[PDB]
Amino acid sequence: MNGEVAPPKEDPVPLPELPCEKSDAYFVLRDGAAGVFLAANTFPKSRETRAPLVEELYRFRDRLPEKLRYLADAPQQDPEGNKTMVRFSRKTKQQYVSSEKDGKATGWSAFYVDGKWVEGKK
């Protein structure tokens, strides 16, 4: 009976081919943060969680759980190269990607509409 709801046990879309911090952990893609994301299997030792980088998704397409065909399908960077990762919007509960340059968050942010990605530059 000892339980706390959503137990640490869970092997949905594990991406062992993506090291986490440095404790032999990896990024096991899961779903429980306003949408989808990839938490470290060493959590909390590694709270590195957040939508999956579209580019890293293309490399993990062979392992894609199929429910990401649209996310990984979205662009994987911007005209400058700032790779674009997945994000989540509550205004429509959907997945929108956003390019990023190093760590300055350029601003690029595309939205996945009806199989219709878009770009809401700001």
Query: Which CATH number goes with the domain that contains 115?
Result: 2.20.25.10
Shared domain for 48 and 76, answered yes or no, is no
Q: Structural domain of residue 71, as residue ranges?
A: 65-122
Q: Cα angle vertex 115, ends 90, 98, to 5°?
A: 50
Whether the Cβ atoms of residue 46 and residue 54 lie closer than 8 Å to each other: no
Q: What's the farthest any 2 CA atoms get from each other in the chain? A: 53
Shared domain for 46 and 101, answered yes or no, is no
Name residue 58's amino acid: Y
Shared domain for 80 and 44, answered yes or no, is no
Q: Cα angle vertex 98, ends 97, 103, to 5°?
A: 140
| Solving technique | NMR
For CA atoms 121, 52, 87, 43, give the dihedral sign: negative
Shared domain for 54 and 1, answered yes or no, is yes
